[PDB]
Design a protein around this nucleic acid. Structure first.
Length: 213
DNA sequence: GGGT
């Protein structure tokens, strides 16, 4: 089930998909050309769908019925991904890929083979020259604005606080969801320098997860 | 399961 095992699987174009293939016997490369809203009727059964384009400029509908929130945040129009674990299913004269089991994988092609999500420590972060990294740190200061959140994060390997800037797209979904002294994973941020003090910044690939501890 |  390793990532490298999943990337092993044969890549297929829309014209090659068959209903009789096992959901995990292939992987599909797709460019997101359209992303719907999340739909919600019931106390908890949200869905959404995207339109993905392949290398023949053909387009196919992908529906997501589980792990909806995470996947909705991952998928951005314009980006290329590998999708693994979807059921090829008939869609009225068409085929579609249907993601229902919550063990499917959406792998962004761009960050493929990078240490961006390597999850190091603040004192380390403040020492290492990577440009993309991830910290499990604690929020000790919050300056929240119209379009931008400035944080100061700290950890137990230093007495220094790290400065973190969060920009439009990702900040909206976080404007007042930060708690002081709570613990968060800052995945795939951008090491950067202003005043020979080192800001972390987010970009299109960044994510944030609240350590449940 | 569900459905644009």
């Amino acid at each position: 089930g390793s990532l490298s095992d999943q990337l092993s699987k044969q890549t297929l174009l829309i014209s090659q998909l068959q209903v009789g293939k096992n959901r995990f016997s292939f992987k599909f490369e797709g460019r997101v050309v359209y992303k719907s809203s999340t739909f919600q009727n019931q106390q908890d059964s949200k869905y959404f769908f995207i339109t993905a384009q392949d290398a023949n400029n053909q387009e196919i509908n992908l529906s997501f019925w589980q792990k909806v929130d995470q996947s909705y945040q991952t998928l951005k129009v314009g980006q290329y991904y590998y999708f693994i674990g979807g059921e090829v299913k008939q869609f009225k004269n068409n085929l579609e890929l249907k993601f229902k089991f919550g063990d499917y994988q959406i792998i962004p092609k761009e960050t493929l083979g990078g240490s961006g999500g390597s999850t190091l420590l603040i004192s380390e972060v403040l020492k290492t020259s990577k440009q993309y990294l991830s910290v499990l740190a604690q929020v000790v200061d919050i300056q929240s604005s119209d379009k931008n959140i400035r944080l100061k994060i700290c950890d137990n390997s230093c007495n220094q606080e790290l400065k973190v800037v969060i920009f439009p797209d990702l900040c909206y979904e976080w404007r007042d969801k930060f708690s002081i002294n709570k613990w968060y994973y800052f995945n795939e941020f951008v090491r950067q320098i202003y005043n020979d003090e080192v800001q972390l910044k987010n970009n299109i690939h960044s994510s944030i997860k609240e350590s449940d501890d």
